[PDB]
């Protein structure tokens, strides 16, 4: 269960780095597109804490 907690912890330090890869500006990014969705379980994490 502490391992599962680590797995949950393995989601937040991700938000540390890919905060700078939030590719949404100019309505033209990498992960997102008018055809490939708005921040989602992968891309929702690109906006979170430091």
């Amino acid at each position: 269960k502490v391992l599962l907690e680590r797995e949950e912890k393995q989601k937040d330090y991700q938000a540390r780095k890919m905060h700078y890869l939030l590719s949404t500006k100019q309505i033209s990014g990498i992960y997102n597109s008018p055809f490939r969705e708005h921040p989602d379980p992968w891309e929702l994490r690109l906006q979170k804490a430091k």
Partner: peptide, 10 residues
């Protein structure tokens, strides 16, 4: 780190 990649992805 996937630099200069937004141009190709767009």
């Amino acid at each position: 780190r996937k630099a200069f990649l937004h141009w190709y992805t767009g």
